[PDB]
Paper text:
Here, we have characterized an exceptionally large microvirus, Ebor, and provide crucial insights into long-standing mechanistic questions. Here, we report the structural analysis of the genome delivery process of a Microviridae phage, Ebor, along with its discovery and characterization. This phage, infecting a model aquatic Alphaproteobacterium Rhodobacter capsulatus, belongs to the microvirus taxon ‘Tainavirinae’ and recognizes the host via five Gokushovirinae-like trimeric protrusions. The capsid exhibits the triangulation number of T=1, being made of 60 copies of the major capsid protein. The core of the major capsid protein contains an 8-stranded antiparallel β-barrel (single jelly-roll fold), the fold shared among all Microviridae.
We isolated two Ebor variants exhibiting different stability during cryo-EM sample preparation. Nanopore sequencing showed a single nucleotide polymorphism leading to S120R amino acid replacement in the major capsid protein. Thus, we designated these variants S120 and R120. Variant R120 virions were purified using CsCl gradient, vitrified and imaged using cryo-EM, yielding stable native particles. Single particle reconstruction produced an icosahedrally averaged map of Ebor at 3.2 Å resolution. The capsid shell has an external diameter of 28 nm and an internal diameter of 25.1 nm. The internal diameter is 3.2 to 4.6 nm larger compared to other determined capsid structures of Microviridae members, allowing Ebor to accommodate larger genome. A striking characteristic of the capsid is the presence of elongated protrusions situated at its three-fold symmetry axes, reaching out 9 nm from its surface. These extensions are formed by loops composed of residues 184-254 from three neighbouring subunits of the major capsid protein. The model showed the tip of the protrusion possesses a positive electrostatic potential, contrary to the negative potential of the capsid’s penton exterior.
Residue numbers in the entry:
A (entry chain B): 3 to 192, 250 to 510
B (entry chain B): 308 to 460
C (entry chain B): 257 to 307
Write the structure that this text describes.
């Protein structure tokens, strides 16, 4: 066995809606052990009508994450020791009991399009779909930032979207600089001496801790543990972690339809319709046990800071001593007053994250309206749909706000988008199948042909 | 046979544009030219025509995710060499409580897993919405009962 | 029956070689081989030279 003998293929088509600013799952293709082949998926996008034209771009998203069976077991039994190991999963499968058992329906399972099973007059679906979604969204959060909030197995609803760039990553800052980089050297003083061997063992510890930072950052999964094993000369088990299959994005197009009646023409009534099409075709990974390829899709607005004080004109005009500037060689604190103007009075003077010397002046990108303009006007031409993040508080946040108001659409709380998916999978498999049966013949028994 | 084309006509008034009013018109043309058969007595060439929706099972449980996750003994799989019964619980989720465990038709070993085609809406979506863009016109056959049925409802 | 057998005779003989060609993991890899599983490689010893 473990060889390709027969073939199974699947072709699922689904339609639905999801709310903007949320990482809505679209489908979940199951993969068994020793299954590999081709997987082609395509997602259409259609948004509800928007008054006026929308110069602000809207981006589309599509992701494909392969969640192995090993990772789903860890969420099911986190406190259990060696829960995620392959052999532990391997032994439980051989026991004859099911590794994953049925559960009631949930919003996560419904959106994937897993049709339920009628058991004892109740709908039932396997727990693997819920665990796979929770692990997949967790995996995407580690990519933007390793120390990110991670969902448990108890989640039963759609999750918020994920930012494309964190505030700290934008300004390349740090909440807390380490004490080793440009650190302290021990001093003997029992007439004393700092000794020449300390500060020599250091001055590479500064170099050695920085390479330790990249090994736990280039690989967000196994982070804060592979560095432990890397120092001792050990390696992690590869199969547990998930991995990414494909990523697609495109700015939604715009089609303008104008009114023609007398009242509409005089006022200037018009419409903006958005649509997009994305697809990918990637091979299916082959594993001894198997997994699920959870697909995601999302629509997000432009991520630009409408509220950020000007680093030059907002603060005082000063003659800078460049001699002292090059002499710092140390992180400089940043207050919330420098990040936005929507700051509370108490939090105006509060260190939020450390950064370099002249950071927040190297780059300054701002998109938004003029402060003199009244937002009640330009209900037509209302193009400004941008994430009005509070900022300052939780700079390291990786997730979108739980409630994102959809201003340009008529209904804020309605699922504005409508999507149609077409997933086609061809999976060579080691499955056996069997011969087809036949139908009863009423000429042989009623005449005794085979006498 | 041919798939009917689609022509989209959109509204232009103020109320229609804001709501998103629009129309879909369908049309088709088919023809044939064949010789008339010759017979001693004769006959009648009855012509038929019909329009039907897509025939895809919107209601069918997933052969993998709906049922339990099991490690399959391929040794016993090749050893069967016999028809395996199928219950109505494996064909759809609109089954009555009594008919959940009732053999409906015998098949092979891993049938219902070789192929799985499904077209329909998401269970989370509310059908009262999308009265516009209402594209889902598919035969919602009860299934299970009368699997050998040849005729439409 | 006798058709499911007459390859069981063939199928048990291939099961004998997989547990004989590999004495280590014997009587267990045949269990995993039927279900489509594999053993962890690093545990077992192996031979270097013979003279």
């Amino acid at each position: 066995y473990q060889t390709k003998r027969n073939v199974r293929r699947e072709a699922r088509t689904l339609m639905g809606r999801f709310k903007a600013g949320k990482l809505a799952p679209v489908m979940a293709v199951p993969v068994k052990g020793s299954e590999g082949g081709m997987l082609s998926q395509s997602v259409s996008f259609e948004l509800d009508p928007i008054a006026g034209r929308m110069a602000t771009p809207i981006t589309a998203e599509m992701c494909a994450v392969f969640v192995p069976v090993q990772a789903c077991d860890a969420l099911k039994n986190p406190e259990a020791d060696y829960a995620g190991m392959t052999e532990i999963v391997r032994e439980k499968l051989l026991s004859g009991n099911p590794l994953f058992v049925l559960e009631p329906e949930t919003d996560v399972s419904k959106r994937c399009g897993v049709n339920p099973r009628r058991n004892n007059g109740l709908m039932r679906v396997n727990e693997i779909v819920r665990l796979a979604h929770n692990c997949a969204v967790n995996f995407l959060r580690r990519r933007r930032y390793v120390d990110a909030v991670q969902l448990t197995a108890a989640n039963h609803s759609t999750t918020p979207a994920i930012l494309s760039q964190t505030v700290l990553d934008r300004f390349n800052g740090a909440l807390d600089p380490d004490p080793n980089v440009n650190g302290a050297v021990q001093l003997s003083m029992p007439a004393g001496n700092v000794s020449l061997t300390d500060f020599y063992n250091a001055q590479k510890m500064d170099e050695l801790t920085r390479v330790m930072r990249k090994i736990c950052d280039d690989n967000p999964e196994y982070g804060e543990e592979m560095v432990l094993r890397w120092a001792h000369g050990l390696s992690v088990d590869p199969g547990r972690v998930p991995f990414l299959l494909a990523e697609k994005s495109v700015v939604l197009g715009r089609q303008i339809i104008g009114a023609t009646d007398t009242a509409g023409v005089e006022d200037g009534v018009k419409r903006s319709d958005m649509a997009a099409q994305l697809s990918f075709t990637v091979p299916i990974p082959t594993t001894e046990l198997g997994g699920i390829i959870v697909t995601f899709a999302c629509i997000k607005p432009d991520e630009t800071l409408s509220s950020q004080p000007h680093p030059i004109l907002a603060d005082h005009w000063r003659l800078d001593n460049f001699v002292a500037d090059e002499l710092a060689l140390d992180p400089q604190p940043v207050m919330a007053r420098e990040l936005d103007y929507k700051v509370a009075q108490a939090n105006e003077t509060t260190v939020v994250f450390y950064t370099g010397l002249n950071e927040l002046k190297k780059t300054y990108v701002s998109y938004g309206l003029c402060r003199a303009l009244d937002p009640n006007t330009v209900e037509s031409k209302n193009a400004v749909w941008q994430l009005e993040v509070p900022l300052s508080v939780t700079p390291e946040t990786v997730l979108y706000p739980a409630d994102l108001p959809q201003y340009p659409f008529a209904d804020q709380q309605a699922e504005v988008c409508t999507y149609v998916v077409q997933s086609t999978a061809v999976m060579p498999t080691p499955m056996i199948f069997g011969p087809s049966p036949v139908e009863q013949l009423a000429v042989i028994e009623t005449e005794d042909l085979f006498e």
